[PDB]
Design a protein around this motif. Structure first.
Motif, mmCIF file in Angstrom:
data_model
loop_
_atom_site.group_PDB
_atom_site.id
_atom_site.type_symbol
_atom_site.label_atom_id
_atom_site.label_comp_id
_atom_site.label_asym_id
_atom_site.label_seq_id
_atom_site.Cartn_x
_atom_site.Cartn_y
_atom_site.Cartn_z
ATOM 1 N N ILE A 49 34.729 36.621 47.473
ATOM 2 C CA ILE A 49 36.106 36.272 47.139
ATOM 3 C C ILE A 49 36.172 35.529 45.810
ATOM 4 O O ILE A 49 37.122 35.708 45.036
ATOM 5 N N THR A 50 35.174 34.687 45.525
ATOM 6 C CA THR A 50 35.136 33.999 44.237
ATOM 7 C C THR A 50 34.835 34.966 43.096
ATOM 8 O O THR A 50 35.437 34.868 42.016
ATOM 9 N N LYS A 51 33.913 35.909 43.322
ATOM 10 C CA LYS A 51 33.596 36.903 42.299
ATOM 11 C C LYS A 51 34.764 37.854 42.066
ATOM 12 O O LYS A 51 35.011 38.278 40.930
ATOM 13 N N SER A 52 35.498 38.195 43.129
ATOM 14 C CA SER A 52 36.694 39.015 42.967
ATOM 15 C C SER A 52 37.817 38.245 42.284
ATOM 16 O O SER A 52 38.627 38.842 41.564
ATOM 17 N N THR A 53 37.877 36.925 42.491
ATOM 18 C CA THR A 53 38.883 36.114 41.813
ATOM 19 C C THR A 53 38.598 35.987 40.321
ATOM 20 O O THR A 53 39.530 36.045 39.508
ATOM 21 N N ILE A 54 37.327 35.816 39.945
ATOM 22 C CA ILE A 54 36.976 35.764 38.525
ATOM 23 C C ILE A 54 37.155 37.132 37.877
ATOM 24 O O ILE A 54 37.664 37.243 36.752
ATOM 25 N N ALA A 55 36.758 38.195 38.585
ATOM 26 C CA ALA A 55 36.918 39.557 38.090
ATOM 27 C C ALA A 55 38.375 39.989 37.987
ATOM 28 O O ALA A 55 38.681 40.881 37.189
ATOM 29 N N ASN A 56 39.274 39.383 38.766
ATOM 30 C CA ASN A 56 40.697 39.653 38.594
ATOM 31 C C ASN A 56 41.298 38.783 37.495
ATOM 32 O O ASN A 56 42.222 39.215 36.793
ATOM 33 N N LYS A 57 40.781 37.560 37.332
ATOM 34 C CA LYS A 57 41.293 36.665 36.298
ATOM 35 C C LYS A 57 40.925 37.139 34.896
ATOM 36 O O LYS A 57 41.693 36.916 33.950
ATOM 37 N N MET A 58 39.768 37.791 34.743
ATOM 38 C CA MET A 58 39.374 38.303 33.432
ATOM 39 C C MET A 58 40.262 39.467 33.000
ATOM 40 O O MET A 58 40.713 39.525 31.848
ATOM 41 N N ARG A 59 40.530 40.401 33.919
ATOM 42 C CA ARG A 59 41.407 41.525 33.606
ATOM 43 C C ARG A 59 42.858 41.084 33.458
ATOM 44 O O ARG A 59 43.616 41.698 32.696
ATOM 45 N N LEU A 60 43.262 40.030 34.176
ATOM 46 C CA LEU A 60 44.599 39.478 33.988
ATOM 47 C C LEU A 60 44.731 38.802 32.628
ATOM 48 O O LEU A 60 45.793 38.870 31.995
ATOM 49 N N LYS A 61 43.661 38.151 32.161
ATOM 50 C CA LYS A 61 43.691 37.533 30.839
ATOM 51 C C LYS A 61 43.672 38.584 29.734
ATOM 52 O O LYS A 61 44.303 38.404 28.685
ATOM 53 N N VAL A 62 42.954 39.691 29.954
ATOM 54 C CA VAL A 62 42.912 40.759 28.956
ATOM 55 C C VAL A 62 44.246 41.496 28.898
ATOM 56 O O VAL A 62 44.721 41.869 27.816
ATOM 57 N N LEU A 63 44.871 41.713 30.060
ATOM 58 C CA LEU A 63 46.179 42.362 30.096
ATOM 59 C C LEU A 63 47.255 41.457 29.510
ATOM 60 O O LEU A 63 48.192 41.927 28.854
ATOM 61 N N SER A 64 47.133 40.145 29.737
ATOM 62 C CA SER A 64 48.029 39.184 29.106
ATOM 63 C C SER A 64 47.835 39.106 27.598
ATOM 64 O O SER A 64 48.812 38.888 26.871
#
Lengths: 593, 49, 45, 165, 457, 250
Positions: free
Chosen positions: D16-31
């Protein structure tokens, strides 16, 4: 203002409307009748008024309110009886001298003639405020606050003026919010539309246990705080004892009873029975009436209060769940709301659906069950809340294949059926594994098994023996008792006492209404231990009639230990259930030799 | 269980250190040729279509 | 529980099979009922 | 059996932590990509807003936008809602707008253009006009901000595919 | 011009015919908020459209209408997986853009996605009875049958939990050696069931490779019925652009069929028998039209919809209408779930006409079709003898009925009982089916060839 | 969307500044420095909403509601231990232990904080009975033991005092014999000589000794028994020797 062009039945047509809508409520005529604009045809809008049309002349003025029909959220909800249309039923007893308002009753939705105790919350002057934050509280519970003062949704700012502790009226303002200038004055009562859901920060999964006050219901498949339960059955399945047990024996901070199609006698009996019952959590005088909210309707009442009863009760349950308290919603029944929607669809002249019901019963039934549930409370504090919706259903077409029962049972996640064969034996409800199902029993058994549970094996063994008892009774009824073994006769003998003691949950006294998990786990553990001891004594050499007749008052004392309130033993486990294991273990040794 | 008491604070270190160089070239590449697409969008916006 | 369209076709064949099985069980019960007393008289003598 | 559930819970927490970091990176790139596209589209609206402040070159674009907005209505009487500084340009070119609109009309020539006294907003709309019917019930956004925002939905994939592809 | 009237959820507005069919329109209200809508039907200076958000708030004579000039199209890209989006546009994890590089229609008019050959790549969902009895492959259309009263959300959560781990079991079988993607589309589902379905994919480790489309039950039916076309267009665009295998799960079809009955209540068309309209086969054919193998001879888009029977039978218009467009289905029994089984799928009311074309060489065997017919014949003989054994008794039953009765009890508690996280192989399912089928003699087996039955005996 | 994140960001900085005015929580305030930075300066709500919409602040409503629920649980746990004060490092270790858990609404810390908050809330509205005084002294000793041992660690005295206070809270006004027997068994089961010494006032212990002296007082008619029983009503502290001497006389 518009002019009434035609009035035929419960629907009225008014022309010259430029502010009408599809869900906005307005008042037609000089008497201020409760109605709402359902549709529009050209320049005129068709308004369906749930009130009686006897005494309304054609040509009166119609003024639209400009918003949908909602209820008032503030201090004064508990200890008062109202309707589904947000109307005060207590003022009709003083002014009109009647229980329900027949017609021409223009009263306020919120009580503005009584004063309440306003105390400050965790906010002060200069601090930031948001929608859903705890701005105040009112002492209206047994040992905690019941009516918490919260801000309206879709608003924010800073608290400029904070009222001190003391008594104030509902019409007087004691709150002032400053956000980009002078926004507006704040009072005790607030407005919120009933056709829109309450806002929240985010939804979460239901993982808290809830006591339903039933040994067979909690033992077979217990529900959680935030789940949906459907209860089918012709002529009810014991909604009075299940509704009173959910409010009295329930562990929720708030209780909301809503009657959309009740006759009025059951709501008056349950309303008058609440003041005589005392709270078991160190309550006060009128403990059950202070934490209970009742919405009473009639069989010939208005359709706006009947259809809007679930919306106003779900909005009040979401408003009480937004403060951080657990609320339980008991609705009875959805068949009167579906028949009220089919009567509005037939009277309005809309296209019908299969089974004679309208097509909006699936979307409205899915939106009504989807509007309740457990989630995070909206606001700066981030509190935890839950809304348990329990709505019973009845057969409108005479069978269990109608769209009303299948539509409400399909969208729901928990089910509690009612058997006519078990219901004919004076046992309600009666379902083990054929009309009852629940997905949260696995996560719900973790906490009750975490304290001191044995229900995890006894529930599957009791559901397996109860499911096999019907299959053994079918072959025993069709062929006879010659093609079955002694194990099926002992399993049917244990299923007869388990179905007789577990299915009977009506109660003949005050001690036969509450059902703890320790008493049901002790009775199911004693019945499973007697069923295993009968199979072990039959395997070691014995007879079935010598085992049951040899047991006798050993099982009769376990079946008879439900007519007394738990006040002995440690906290709820009396010594009669503890000595029944040693008596059955002593009788099992003598039954073998 | 010890990997969950230090991994909850490393989500911002791993997410900031993971994508830290692409955010500068993505903003530099858009600001480099912004006038070439702004002139085509301004020329296309001034015509009836 | 049950179907809502075209469900009488199984109940017609089930009623016909139940009637044929009841007729065969009535014939076998009549034959055994005759043979029981037919052996019971000679056993009685 | 007592240890295996805690081990699976620890693995689920790490995933869940690795999925949270992996979602936060793509959210930062999309932002970041959405901030770059919003920065280019924000600069285009500022360039069009700066170019819209000229009353000499903005007259043929305003007359062509009034003729293009009048070509999608097909009404005998057209009400043009513009700013206070654009009513004089349409007033000095209503005959050329009616002659140029009638020269390329598909239904019929315009009878008369009524300049309404109501002005448009000046907080987020700089320049342009709003075409409306005679009854004032149907409005066509013929502004530079609405035309650039409507053209940005179709120009965003071509610029995004060439800039980030 | 303005809103002429409103009948039910749809509103009838009087405007011009300048807008095209299915073109997006914007209704300007006097309350300070603009709403979007889709043109459901065009008329002679009249239009019938439904609002995307809400149903109340519009005016009567003071309303304003405007045409956007662009048709309904969702921007599809390669960065849609991993993020959380909504069907109508509720942003909770999304930003201003959806990362769409190309514009594609939501109906598949210019695409025409369909396979022109039989499926060779075998796909398994982790079920021995579903994979062995059905033999589904890539590009097949087989919906899941449910019932009203049984745990259909638990079976959909188990099938959604099994999606993601089928790639490592299918990679060992040599039936799938490419990328795997999941397309999740929700419409009319609860928040707890969607949170449990997202928690199953997050616990399985497929949250980054799966896309989530959330649709509420209190929203309009046009957004919930429009979300599966956008999810199927995104899965077809991602599967067609990269040649990857995309699995689309559409739940639930009863919410789309119930939402389709509310529509067409203010138009010229009317509903048919049982409340559902007669043109629902074209509406289900529009969603099922984008299913099959992609063009290129590499990759395919599979569709596995979840449908629940409201009457507990196949005579209803929802399962009967959706079952006609497909080539079979899987029947879930509540009697097996009552006694205790996961999943409670039966093999009596289940048949597939693509089992021979799905099974090939190097990823399957030849005796699976005869073993499935022998297991279906033994299960039909045991289920047929079980109903007759209750009426007459055990005094008139032969050894052949007792062999099928023992084989139904042995195969009922062995093949139907399985985990929710482990994926069984097809060879282990055929080997387990041979052990359950090895209870009778060799002469008593006639649903297979003697050459293949003698070798695998 | 942005208004709830701005209200949670302002409520997180306001709750962090109202939690401790000395700035001793550098470990818990280190992760929340991005929200306290916007609260420690002159920033409007439109600048916070525009900064959150522009990717310059946190925009996760679930993470902000979970961190605001954890900070509200730590502030409610620190506020529920009044009028006692816990350790500075124990609050950072309890906040770090609570932050490392995935569940924050059904854990043992929320059930223990709600259980102590139920007895603390019921202690301000109790009637004139001995169960409110015994539950007040047991809630004071349980508050001192909860402030000394924390809420993350396990203790038999906190579970026995929480079970005795929870069982005494559900009792009615007709169970004075069970509350007196439970108070006598709980006082006799304690290993310490005085469980109310150094925590409550002398009048509270004198009222607790006067409750047992008044309960055991109407059971003898002898002069020797009433004279020896009357001498124990002047002590300002309750001990096991007074309960053994009172039980020996009765």
């Amino acid at each position: 203002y518009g002019a009434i062009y035609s009035v035929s039945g419960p629907v009225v047509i008014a022309e010259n409307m430029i502010g009408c809508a599809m869900y906005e409520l307005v008042k037609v005529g000089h008497d201020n009748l409760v109605g709402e604009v359902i549709r529009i045809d050209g320049d005129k809008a068709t308004i369906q008024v749930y009130e009686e049309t006897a005494g309304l002349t054609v040509g009166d003025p119609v003024l639209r309110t400009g918003k949908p029909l909602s209820v008032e959220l503030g201090p004064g909800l508990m200890e008062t009886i109202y309707d589904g249309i947000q109307r005060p039923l207590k003022a009709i007893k003083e002014e009109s001298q009647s229980i329900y308002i027949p017609r021409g009753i223009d009263t306020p939705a919120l009580d503005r003639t009584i004063k309440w105790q306003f105390t400050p919350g965790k906010f002060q002057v200069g601090d930031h405020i948001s929608g859903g934050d705890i701005y105040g509280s009112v002492f209206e519970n047994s040992l905690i606050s019941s009516h918490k003062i919260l801000l309206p949704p879709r608003s924010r700012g800073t608290i400029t003026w904070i009222a001190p502790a003391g008594e104030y009226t509902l019409d007087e303002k004691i709150l002032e919010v400053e956000f980009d200038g002078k926004k507006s004055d704040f009072t005790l009562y607030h407005t919120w539309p009933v056709r829109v859901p309450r806002p929240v920060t985010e939804k979460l999964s239901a993982d808290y246990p809830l006591l339903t006050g039933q040994r067979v219901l909690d033992a077979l498949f217990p529900c959680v705080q935030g789940g949906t339960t459907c209860i089918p059955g012709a002529f009810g399945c014991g909604k009075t004892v299940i509704s009173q047990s959910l409010s009295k024996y329930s562990n929720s901070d708030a209780i909301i009873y809503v009657g959309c199609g009740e006759r009025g006698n059951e709501m008056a009996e349950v309303l008058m029975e609440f003041p005589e019952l005392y709270t078991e959590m160190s309550g006060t005088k009128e403990p059950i009436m202070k934490r209970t909210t009742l919405v009473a309707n009639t069989s010939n009442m208005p359709v706006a209060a009947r259809e809007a009863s679930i919306y106003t009760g779900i909005t009040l349950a979401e408003y009480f769940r937004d403060q951080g308290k657990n609320v339980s919603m008991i609705a009875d029944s959805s068949s009167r709301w579906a028949e009220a929607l089919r009567e509005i669809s037939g009277r309005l002249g809309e296209m019908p659906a299969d089974q004679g019901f309208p097509a909006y019963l699936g979307a409205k039934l899915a939106s009504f069950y989807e509007r309740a549930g457990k989630a995070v409370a909206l606001g700066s504090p981030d509190r935890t809340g839950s809304v348990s919706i329990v709505a019973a259903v009845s057969p409108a077409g005479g069978d269990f294949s109608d769209p009303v029962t299948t539509a409400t049972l399909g969208i729901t996640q928990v089910f509690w059926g009612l058997d006519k064969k078990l219901a004919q034996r004076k046992h309600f409800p009666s379902i083990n594994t054929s009309v009852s199902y629940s997905k949260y029993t696995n996560v719900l058994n973790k906490f009750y098994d975490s304290n001191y549970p044995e229900f995890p094996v006894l529930r599957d063994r009791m559901k397996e023996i109860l499911s096999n008892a019907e299959e053994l009774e079918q072959v025993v009824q069709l062929v006879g008792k010659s093609a079955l073994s002694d194990s099926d006769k002992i399993t049917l003998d244990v299923a007869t006492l388990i179905k007789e003691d577990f299915l009977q949950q009506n109660g003949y006294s005050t001690y036969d209404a509450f059902c703890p998990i320790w008493k049901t786990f002790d009775m199911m553990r004693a019945f499973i231990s007697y069923h295993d001891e009968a199979q072990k004594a039959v395997a070691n050499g014995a007879n079935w009639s010598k085992l049951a007749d040899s047991t006798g008052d050993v099982k009769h004392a376990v079946s008879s230990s439900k007519f007394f309130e738990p006040s002995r033993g440690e906290k709820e486990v009396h010594g009669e259930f503890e000595k029944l294991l040693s008596t059955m273990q002593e009788r099992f040794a003598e039954s073998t030799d | 269980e010890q990997k969950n008491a230090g991994g909850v604070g490393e989500l911002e270190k791993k997410a900031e250190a993971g994508v830290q160089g692409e955010l500068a070239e993505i903003k530099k590449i858009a600001e480099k040729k912004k006038d070439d697409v702004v002139k085509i969008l301004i020329e296309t916006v001034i015509k009836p279509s | 529980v049950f179907p809502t369209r075209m469900t009488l076709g199984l109940m017609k064949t089930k009623l016909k099979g139940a009637n044929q099985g009841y007729s065969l069980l009535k014939r076998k019960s009549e034959a055994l009922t005759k043979r029981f007393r037919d052996i019971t008289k000679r056993i009685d003598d | 059996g007592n240890f295996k559930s805690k081990l699976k819970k620890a693995m689920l927490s790490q995933q869940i932590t690795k999925s949270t970091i992996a979602n936060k990176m793509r959210l930062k790139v999309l932002s970041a990509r959405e901030q770059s596209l919003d920065g280019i589209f924000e600069e285009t609206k500022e360039k069009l807003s700066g170019i819209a402040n000229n009353r000499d070159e903005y007259k043929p674009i305003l007359q062509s936008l009034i003729v293009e907005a009048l070509l999608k209505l097909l009404e005998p009487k057209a009400i043009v809602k513009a700013l206070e500084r654009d009513v004089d340009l349409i007033e000095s070119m209503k005959d050329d707008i009616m002659r140029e609109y009638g020269e390329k009309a598909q239904r019929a020539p315009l009878e008369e253009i009524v300049i309404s006294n109501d002005y448009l907003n000046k907080d987020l709309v700089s320049g342009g006009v709003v075409v409306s019917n005679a009854s004032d019930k149907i409005e066509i956004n013929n502004t530079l901000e609405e035309r650039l925002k409507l053209l940005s939905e179709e120009a965003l994939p071509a610029i995004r595919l060439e800039l980030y592809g | 011009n303005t809103v002429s009237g409103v009948n039910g959820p749809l509103v009838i507005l009087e405007k011009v015919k300048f807008p095209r069919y299915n073109e997006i329109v914007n209704l300007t209200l006097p309350d300070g908020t603009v709403r979007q809508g889709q043109v459901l039907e065009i008329r002679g200076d009249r239009a019938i459209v439904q609002v995307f958000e809400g149903t109340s708030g519009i005016d009567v004579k003071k309303t304003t209408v405007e045409f956007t000039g662009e048709s309904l199209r969702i921007p599809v890209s390669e960065d849609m997986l991993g993020r959380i989006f909504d069907g109508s546009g509720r942003p909770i994890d999304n930003g201003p853009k959806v990362f769409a590089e190309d514009y594609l229609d939501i109906n598949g008019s210019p695409i025409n996605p369909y396979a022109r050959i039989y499926p060779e790549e075998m796909i398994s969902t982790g079920v021995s009875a579903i994979d062995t009895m059905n033999s589904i492959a890539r590009g097949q259309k087989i919906p899941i049958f449910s019932a009203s009263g049984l745990p259909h959300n638990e079976i959909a959560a188990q099938i959604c939990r099994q999606a993601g781990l089928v790639r490592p079991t299918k990679d060992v079988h040599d039936g799938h050696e490419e990328n795997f993607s999941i397309v999740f589309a929700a419409m009319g589902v609860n928040l707890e069931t969607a949170r449990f379905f997202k928690q199953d994919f997050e616990e399985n480790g497929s949250l980054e490779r799966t896309s989530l489309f959330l649709n509420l039950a209190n929203d309009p039916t046009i957004e919930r019925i429009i979300t599966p076309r956008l999810a199927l267009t995104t899965a077809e665009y991602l599967a067609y652009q990269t040649e990857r295998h995309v699995l689309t799960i559409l739940t639930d079809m009863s919410s789309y069929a119930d939402a389709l009955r509310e529509v067409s209540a203010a138009r010229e068309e009317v509903p048919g028998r049982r409340g559902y309209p007669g043109y629902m086969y074209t509406d289900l054919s529009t969603i099922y039209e984008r299913a099959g193998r992609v063009e290129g001879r590499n990759g395919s888009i599979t569709q596995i919809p979840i449908l629940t029977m409201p009457n507990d039978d196949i005579t209803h218009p929802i399962p009967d209408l959706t079952g006609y467009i497909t080539e079979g289905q899987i029947f879930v029994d509540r009697q097996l779930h009552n006694k205790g089984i996961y999943p409670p799928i039966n093999v009596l009311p289940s048949l597939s006409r693509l089992m021979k074309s799905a099974i090939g060489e190097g990823m399957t065997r030849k005796d699976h079709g005869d073993v499935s017919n022998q297991l279906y014949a033994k299960y039909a003989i045991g289920k047929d003898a079980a109903a007759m054994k209750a009426v007459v008794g055990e005094e008139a039953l032969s050894i052949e009925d007792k062999l099928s009765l023992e084989f139904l009890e042995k195969f009922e508690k062995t093949f139907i009982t399985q985990g929710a996280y482990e994926d069984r192989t097809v060879f282990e399912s055929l080997d387990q089916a041979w052990s359950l089928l090895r209870i009778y003699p060799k002469e008593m087996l006639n649903r297979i060839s003697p050459k293949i039955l003698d070798e695998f005996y | 969307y942005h208004s709830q994140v701005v209200g949670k960001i302002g409520y997180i900085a306001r709750c962090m500044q109202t939690i401790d005015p000395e700035n001793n929580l550098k470990k818990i305030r280190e992760d929340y420095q991005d929200v306290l930075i916007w609260a420690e300066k002159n920033y409007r709500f439109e600048e916070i909403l525009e900064a959150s919409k522009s990717g310059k602040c946190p925009n996760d409503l679930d993470a902000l509601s979970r961190r605001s629920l954890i900070l509200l649980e730590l502030l409610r746990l620190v506020s529920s231990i009044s009028p006692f004060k816990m350790k500075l490092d124990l609050i950072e270790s309890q906040y770090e232990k609570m932050k490392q858990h995935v569940n924050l609404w059904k854990s043992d810390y929320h059930v223990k904080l709600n259980q102590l908050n139920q007895l603390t809330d019921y202690l301000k509205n109790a009637a004139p009975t001995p169960k409110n005084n015994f539950l007040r002294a047991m809630t004071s000793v349980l508050q001192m033991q909860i402030a000394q041992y924390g809420i993350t660690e396990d203790n038999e005295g906190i579970n026995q005092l929480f079970k005795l206070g929870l069982h005494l809270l559900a009792m009615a006004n007709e169970k004075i014999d069970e509350q007196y027997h439970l108070f006598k068994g709980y006082v006799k089961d304690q290993p310490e000589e005085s469980p109310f010494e150094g925590i409550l006032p002398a009048e509270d212990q004198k009222i607790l000794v006067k409750t047992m002296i008044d309960y055991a007082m109407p059971k003898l008619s002898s002069k020797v028994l009433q004279d020896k029983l009357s001498a124990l009503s002047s002590s300002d502290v309750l001990t096991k020797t007074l309960l053994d001497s009172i039980d020996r006389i009765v």
